[PDB]
Write a protein that binds this ligand. Structure first.
Ligand SMILES: CCCC(=O)C(=O)O
Ligand code: NI
Length: 179
């Protein structure tokens, strides 16, 4: 089962787990109240998986590509990695399907406290437009991921503060309505 937790108070070493002490796990159901959705898939089948297709059609994820994040192969690696981990939001969904390796997506909860989501092979996640988030590799320092998008992609991050955007306003409005 996919693991998520509240983070400790250390600001050092973003790639470590940073589990709060004592443990404060976060359920998939609490993530749903933040509009964060999750599916589990057989990642070996990603080239041809009726179960992925079901998700894509339901959600209108009509666009996809594959990205591989490691020091050696990714162009402009160091800079891209810095940008991923800056707290930011987008005007669209962020949908990522992990094909190999692993990573952390951090999201703010309703009190603006960080929740760390551990994503592994087979895990697929969508972060809603307007949510403040960031991504980092974990200590294994490797991830291969499918990126999906509702239509032709725009990747632009807006680093916090980014509160004026309609996507942020609507997302705040969505949060009033959940548990
Ligand atoms: C696999 C996640 C990396 C990424 O595409 C992002 O954080 O924008
Ligand atoms: Ni992002």
């Amino acid at each position: 089962m996919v693991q998520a937790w509240y983070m400790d108070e250390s600001t050092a070493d973003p790639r470590k787990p940073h589990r709060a002490q004592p443990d404060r796990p976060v359920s998939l159901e609490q993530l749903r109240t933040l509009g964060v959705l999750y599916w589990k898939l057989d990642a070996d089948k990603y080239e041809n998986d009726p179960e992925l297709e079901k998700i894509r059609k339901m959600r209108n994820y009509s666009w996809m590509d594959i990205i591989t994040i490691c020091k050696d192969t990714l162009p402009n690696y160091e800079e891209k990695i810095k940008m991923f981990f800056e707290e930011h939001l987008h005007l669209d969904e962020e949908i990522r399907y992990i094909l190999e390796g692993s990573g952390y997506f951090d999201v703010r909860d309703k009190e603006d406290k960080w929740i760390r989501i551990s994503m592994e092979k087979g895990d697929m996640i969508t972060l809603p437009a307007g949510i403040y988030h960031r991504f980092t590799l974990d200590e294994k320092n490797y991830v291969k991921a499918m990126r999906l998008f509702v239509g032709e992609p725009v990747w632009t991050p807006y680093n916090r503060p980014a509160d004026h955007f309609d996507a942020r306003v609507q997302y705040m409005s969505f949060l009033e309505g959940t548990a």
